[PDB]
Symmetry: D2
Subunit: 112 residues, 4 copies
């Protein structure tokens, strides 16, 4: 699994479950083309977005729909979404920690 | 001023100085239009991006060039940039402070929103 | 002033107001001795805890009472407090800003250290 | 496993390996008694600190030796350690994200 996303909820102290995200790859004309997507599981994790053969070097964007998540909980959020943009050039775990008015994101980059 | 951005360096324990950023506003046709830009001062702050009159309702994007910042310090970071996207002023005018805390493989962003 | 603490609320997107905190300094015999205390203002800041003369070299602890803060807002948080422990002024006097960002099950703390 | 600690390195983008920590339980006389300890594995995780029978209600402190970790990497740290103090009253995952001048800690509290 070349790419995994994990999302946590800092208000409830839990995995952030059923959070939708899309992954985009930067095209030559500077636009973002959809590449993959999914929703986090009960453990707040999203696996299997891509394979090693498909996951080639490039600039990737993970757009996490944090707003819909907070809406479902009845809490006013600040951000429209959380966006993680990076050059891939390895095993990637993107972790996102969510609060209504704040988020943090980290990458744990491992050599398989 | 209604919009201010503060950037901190979590490796050096300092303001993140000379950090470039660009602000966009989502147009009627859904494209991102250039709104404002600047770089952080010696205190890591960027003031005077907009005015109360110009800063109307809408969806705004702040793209902070964190990669150039890390690169100038000799570090190859993970992120291309740090991006903050938010609806502003939909219940009337507010003052927004966007704070970003930077590490080479991680960033945190927070908003302090006050009613003037 | 050489030591300042700023506290923010990540749920409301606001300064964390009226947050109590106590500062300790490690004595020669390794016990924590009371150094200073106070609470955050309307801007979430606590100034005037110490002076350049009093704030000598040593190991300092800031215990921020985050639990009372969350409890007054009707929330049962995870942490008893947020604690910042650090050696100060060991290369000469510095100004320290301690920033804490609070959520019910998470907190982040950063230090901005500047040479006056 | 009633209690797990996970530590990440925000400078290197990796698990924080070989990080020592001690766990204390608050005694009746207000002092901290050692309860358990260990070092994070290659995956930055520390498992098996306690069992369900031993892990009774109380106030617990996890003292993470972040200073020794940064020292080993040749980077000047700000903090003496990272301290996580909480009332236990469930499955606990304490995650700590480390930078030289900053740390964040979150709890992911699960019902088994
Ligand atoms: O450190 C912060 C933070 C901040 C940002 C991200 C974090 O994870 C923690 C604190 C926010 O607003 C500030 C505002 C300030 O005036 C000074 C500061 O040091 C900060
Ligand atoms: O909490 C995290 C974080 C994390 C994210 C943001 C923070 O501010 C702190 C920790 C990173 O990787 C994980 C990885 C995990 O397997 C489990 C976790 O709980 C986390």
């Amino acid at each position: 699994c070349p790419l995994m996303v994990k999302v946590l909820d800092a208000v409830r102290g839990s995995p952030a479950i059923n959070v939708a995200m899309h992954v985009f790859r930067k095209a030559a004309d500077d636009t973002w083309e959809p590449f993959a997507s999914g929703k986090t599981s009960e453990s707040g994790e999203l696996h299997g977005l891509t394979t090693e053969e498909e996951f080639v070097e490039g600039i990737y964007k993970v757009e996490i729909d944090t707003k819909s998540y907070w809406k479902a909980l009845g809490i006013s959020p600040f951000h429209e979404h959380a966006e993680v943009v990076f050059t891939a050039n390895r095993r990637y775990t993107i972790a996102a920690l969510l609060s209504p008015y704040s988020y943090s994101t980290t990458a744990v980059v491992t050599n398989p």
